[PDB]
């Protein structure tokens, strides 16, 4: 779906853009730059890889993008590095970056999805599997499913999977700024409350999509964090996460729970990659590429949504329902 | 196309949302709430209407939405108000709000596009035509087009059109925050420059889509504002705006023009509705519903984008190309 065919004819389009897929341009310009400029994400990968990469170790990377993580493994002295990348253009660009860094003899980039990758494409099973395909929801880009496919077919029992652990969290919040742009009551004496019939209390929406950064606005956490699930990328699979779980939450503050905020932490040994707003205060790129997810809360199913109200010390039961692929979930007060 | 049809079976959807089209839910949840809580925008319409509405005046509104502006006209004592709303479900909701405010005798809502509105649908030609269908780009939702059509067919020579004037502005800006998420150099000694090939220096992108509020980040304006065009809604036509215009811009500061920032001003009598960041520092909801638009600036058409660099006192020539309907435009340094 060429970019130039999606643009009015009176508007100039430079040659470098004309024939590239519009969806690729959109994705790259929304988060790839932010992602590449997340210095702490880059440092996380470098430090974990530094512990495992020796001149004898082969490295397989799922989802090369710019080739940065592949370049890191080679920089660290890896025997060989194979990176796979589903986008034809990104694969070209990753090879250009590789040559620009003089690592052409060390890193091969294959244009294909990791599901199409077969043992004949690698010299031997890799000593290290490397990926960064986490979404705003941790499993939002099907990270576990892709790692699982590769794990079943191409690895060996001694392969190191980076990163090793991930945990997804939820916490109910009061947030006046969010409330202000997701609800209405009226203007002066004019009642407009029937617009509330359409309030979307089902979807998971990324904070970026609201045009809001959580670190930048005032919000109150109304309970301790709720651990929705935990994954070990070397042994878990998506069906280990139950389709429906229940959580009993004790209110530590009084207030209105406007939304559930979702964030996650990924770890390997002592190193941590977190999207908790409290950890990203001075990481603007991370907030722009991952940020956090939100779900507006409705207390019942009346013709109008009902505010979820917390009183400190009371218990509140939430039912968590997952989609079939575990990419989407929903939290409902019971 | 119903909401429930796009959602995983395991996720509960309240009855109020089930059948409503996913496009309606998305638009309402993204912009409508912020819009209705734009208190200055509401005040603007009330104060302008207050100058023209008498017990004798008939009022037609294009784009009823929640019904707010039609309710205002009724509150000021209009003889009759007809509003047209193209969304079927929104039309129903407006009627609900109209009933909740006991104004069923004064306001009627018709479900249809204004282009299908005919004189037989009105008591008589209105003394006042009212609309708020401005986008982030002033003409981004075809405001001039819809008003002109109604102006050709349904009004009378003494009909007051609200609002009367609009002016679209552009100003080159340096913004490090924007630069950090729209460009890449590399990480440490790893060069990633070739990802720059896909930098989207063509599209008009809303600040909100970048996850940024212009008010909340440091940016420098590098010249005086550039007036792209002005409109009088009672006499202007689409073709008043040339398909192409040239602007000679004088650098008032030295710096890198990372982007062109676009904002507008709509006026009627002494009253003003502006999207200039300076004017919306204390209006979060406006910044979320309208905000500003941005276009990243490329100097030439080589394999990689070239920075536009301003030297103070020097002048720079831009070619502005508009789309056929004037909804889209593009600023290119010559």
């Amino acid at each position: 779906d060429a970019f130039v065919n999606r643009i009015d004819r009176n508007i100039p389009v430079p040659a470098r853009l004309r024939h590239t897929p519009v969806s690729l341009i959109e994705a790259v310009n929304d988060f790839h730059y932010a992602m590449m400029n997340d210095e702490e994400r880059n440092n996380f990968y470098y430090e974990v890889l530094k512990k495992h990469v020796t001149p004898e170790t082969g490295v397989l990377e799922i989802g090369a993008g710019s080739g940065l993580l592949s370049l890191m493994a080679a920089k660290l002295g890896a025997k060989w590095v194979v990176a796979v990348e589903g986008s034809e253009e990104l694969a070209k660009l990753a090879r250009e970056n590789i040559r620009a860094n003089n690592m052409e003899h060390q890193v091969k980039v294959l244009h294909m999805m990791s599901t199409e990758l077969k043992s004949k494409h690698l010299p031997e099973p890799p000593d290290v599997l490397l990926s960064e395909i986490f979404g705003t929801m941790m499993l939002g880009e099907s990270a576990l499913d892709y790692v699982v496919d590769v794990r079943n077919r191409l690895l060996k029992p001694t392969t190191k999977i980076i990163p090793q652990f991930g945990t997804q969290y939820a916490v109910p919040i009061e947030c006046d700024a969010l409330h202000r742009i997701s609800s209405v009551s009226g203007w002066r004496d004019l009642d407009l409350k029937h617009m509330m019939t359409l309030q979307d209390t089902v979807s998971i929406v990324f904070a970026k999509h609201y045009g809001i950064r959580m670190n930048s606005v005032n919000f109150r956490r109304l309970s301790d964090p709720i651990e929705l699930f935990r994954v070990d990328f070397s042994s878990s699979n998506r069906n280990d996460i139950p389709r429906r779980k229940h959580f009993d939450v004790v209110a530590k503050e009084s207030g209105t729970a406007h939304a559930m905020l979702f964030y996650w932490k990924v770890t390997d040994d002592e190193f941590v990659m977190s999207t908790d707003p409290e950890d990203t205060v001075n990481n603007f790129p991370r907030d722009m590429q991952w940020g956090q997810a939100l779900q507006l809360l409705d207390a019942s199913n009346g013709p109008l949504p009902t505010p979820v109200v917390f009183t400190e010390g009371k218990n509140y039961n939430f039912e968590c329902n997952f989609s079939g692929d575990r990419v989407i979930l929903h939290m409902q007060l019971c | 196309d119903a909401f429930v049809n796009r959602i995983d079976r395991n996720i509960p959807v309240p009855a109020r949302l089930r059948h409503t089209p996913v496009s309606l839910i998305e638009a309402v949840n993204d912009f409508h709430y912020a819009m209705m809580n734009d208190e200055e925008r509401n005040n603007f319409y009330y104060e302008v209407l207050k100058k023209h509405v008498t017990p004798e005046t008939g009022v037609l509104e294009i784009g009823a939405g929640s019904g707010l502006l039609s309710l205002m006209a009724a509150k000021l004592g209009a003889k009759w108000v007809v509003a047209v709303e193209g969304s079927e479900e929104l039309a129903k909701l407006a009627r609900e709000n109209i009933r909740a405010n006991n104004m069923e005798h004064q306001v009627k809502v018709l479900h249809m596009m204004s282009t299908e509105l005919k004189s037989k649908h009105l008591p008589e030609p209105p003394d006042v035509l009212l609309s708020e269908i401005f986008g982030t780009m002033m003409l981004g939702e075809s405001a001039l087009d819809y008003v002109v059509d109604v102006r050709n067919r349904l009004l009378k020579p003494t009909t007051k059109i609200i609002p009367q004037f609009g002016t679209q502005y552009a100003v080159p800006i340096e913004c490090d925050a924007l630069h950090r998420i729209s460009s890449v150099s590399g990480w440490r000694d790893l060069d990633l420059k070739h990802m720059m090939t896909l930098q989207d220096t063509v599209s008009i992108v809303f600040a909100k889509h970048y996850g940024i509020r212009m008010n909340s980040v440091n940016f420098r304006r590098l010249s005086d504002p550039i007036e792209l065009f002005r409109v009088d809604f009672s006499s202007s036509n689409r073709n008043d705006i040339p398909r192409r215009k040239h602007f000679d811009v004088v650098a008032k500061e030295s710096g890198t023009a990372h982007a062109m920032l676009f904002y507008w001003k709509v006026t009627d009598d002494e009253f003003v509705m502006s999207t200039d960041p300076e004017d919306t520092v204390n209006n979060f909801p406006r910044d979320m519903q309208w905000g500003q638009a941005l276009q990243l600036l490329d100097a030439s058409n080589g394999p990689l984008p070239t920075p536009v660099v301003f030297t103070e006192g020097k002048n720079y020539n831009f070619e502005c190309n508009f789309s056929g309907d004037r909804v889209i435009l593009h600023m290119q340094l010559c």
């Binding site: 986490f134 880009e141 990324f206 590429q289 | 889509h209 996850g211």
Partner: peptide
């Protein structure tokens, strides 16, 4: 708007 970020990732997923």
């Amino acid at each position: 708007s970020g990732r997923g």
